[PDB]
């Protein structure tokens, strides 16, 4: 599993507390380093310290792949992306929460989508 994929899994999911069931923390606290114990911690804090221990090279790559995939399957709640493009149809829809749907915004490919993402922010 790639490395920026773990960064995007850290970045995109909702910040939850008490989402880790007993088997996950039972594997995790013995699986990760001896530094931090993660009890009642937010998703961003756990993912940031695991990505930092992956950056400052102390733990291997396959362990980080397993624990980031475990943090992926343990979370089902996603943040809303505010901007969804139709690729072949060359369109860009924008999320409107009162409709709970993506209303039409502008004609544009991926570069216009990245421009709008840099302007308005990538998430809701």
């Amino acid at each position: 599993m790639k490395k920026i994929e773990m960064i995007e899994i850290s970045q995109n999911r909702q910040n939850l507390t008490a989402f880790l069931h007993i088997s996950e923390i039972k594997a995790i606290n013995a699986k990760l380093a001896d530094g931090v114990d993660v009890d009642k911690k937010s998703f961003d804090e756990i993912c940031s310290i695991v990505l930092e221990q992956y950056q400052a090279k102390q733990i291997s790559n396959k362990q980080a792949s397993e624990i980031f995939e475990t943090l992926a399957k343990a979370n089902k709640s996603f943040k809303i992306e505010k901007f969804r493009c139709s690729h072949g149809y060359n369109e860009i829809y924008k999320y409107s929460p009162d409709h709970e749907a993506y209303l039409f915004y502008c004609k544009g490919g991926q570069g216009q989508l990245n421009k709008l993402i840099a302007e308005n922010g990538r998430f809701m």
Partner: protein
């Protein structure tokens, strides 16, 4: 060889706006002078019933938000008090020439795409897909919510050759199922006609008329429209319905979805009813995605595994790929 940067198919199954009128059962043969189902505008008063998120779940805040009601003014469609059946009429034309793209970048890609589609067609034609489309026409699925709780649905499918009706079919839509695709002695002529239309031989235009015996003065459900509800007054329009020239109707793509609800080859469970042929075959009701692209069973994987790598899928999945070509869109980028 890669896929083309542009490749787009027209829809080869074109219905009109299924417009609805009202009348009395057992006089439904002389039913070309029935009055339309007009969309009236009534006023509702809703109350709080959404889930509170334990921030306004206080004894005083809920009692203060109960006393302030939610006044709205919604459109509504109903049969008249002397009419107890709903007649929904549209025309469906089957174009044909399925796997021929309408705007293709590459020639070496589209020639072998036409070769794979032609190998499918002369190997096993559109008879399975036309059987399933004729089942979604005979079983009146295009009455979406005007079919639940109905007493007796009856579908009349003409075949308008040159203005003159050349061939007639009459189905009891509740006798034949909505799940099991069993063969009937009369339905096979309609399936043969749709197969002849899709295969190129002839011009097929049917006139589909569905009578659903709802009840005297009951409610019919036409297609609903989009509202940009920025701000509301005392009572502001919160729901509007579709109407072609002051007469309620279902949208042409909602009675098109109920025509291509033929996909029962998806890997999850073929016993939980057919779904709509879509890439990453999805239902917004169930909120999930059959044919997940983590599996190798979506449309956008089987397509370039069939055209590029020449890995011909299962016989029951080539029907899905060709049915998604009949649906249309731009594939490949």
């Amino acid at each position: 060889l890669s896929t083309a940067s542009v490749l787009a198919f027209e829809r080869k199954l074109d219905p009109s706006d299924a417009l609805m009128s009202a009348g009395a059962w057992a006089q439904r043969d002389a039913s070309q002078e029935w009055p339309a189902v007009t969309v009236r505008e009534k006023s509702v008063r809703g109350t709080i019933s959404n889930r509170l998120k334990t921030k306004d779940r206080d004894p005083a805040k809920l009692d203060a938000s109960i006393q302030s009601p939610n006044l709205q003014t919604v459109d509504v469609a109903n049969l008249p008090s002397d009419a107890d059946t709903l007649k929904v009429r549209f025309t469906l034309r089957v174009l044909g020439g399925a796997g021929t793209p309408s705007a293709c970048n590459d020639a070496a890609y589209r020639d072998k795409l036409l070769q794979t589609v032609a190998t499918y067609v002369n190997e096993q034609g559109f008879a399975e897909l036309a059987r399933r489309y004729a089942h979604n026409l005979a079983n009146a699925r295009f009455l979406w919510r005007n079919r639940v709780g109905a007493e007796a649905v009856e579908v009349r499918i003409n075949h308008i050759r040159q203005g003159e009706v050349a061939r007639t079919w009459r189905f009891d839509a509740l006798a034949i199922g909505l799940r099991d695709f069993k063969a009937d002695a009369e339905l096979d002529a309609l399936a043969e006609l749709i197969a002849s239309g899709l295969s190129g031989s002839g011009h097929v235009l049917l006139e589909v008329v569905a009578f659903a015996r709802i009840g005297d003065g009951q409610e019919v459900f036409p297609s609903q429209e989009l509202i940009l509800d920025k701000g509301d007054k005392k009572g502001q329009k919160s729901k509007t319905l579709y109407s072609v020239r002051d007469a309620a109707a279902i949208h042409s793509q909602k009675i098109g979805n109920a025509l291509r609800t033929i996909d029962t080859w998806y890997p999850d469970e073929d016993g939980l009813g057919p779904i709509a042929v879509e890439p990453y075959g999805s239902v917004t009701s169930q909120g999930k995605a059959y044919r997940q692209p983590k599996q190798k069973l979506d449309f956008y994987t089987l397509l370039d595994n069939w055209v590029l790598r020449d890995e011909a899928p299962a016989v029951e999945q080539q029907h899905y790929v060709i049915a998604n070509l009949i649906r249309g869109g731009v594939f490949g980028e």
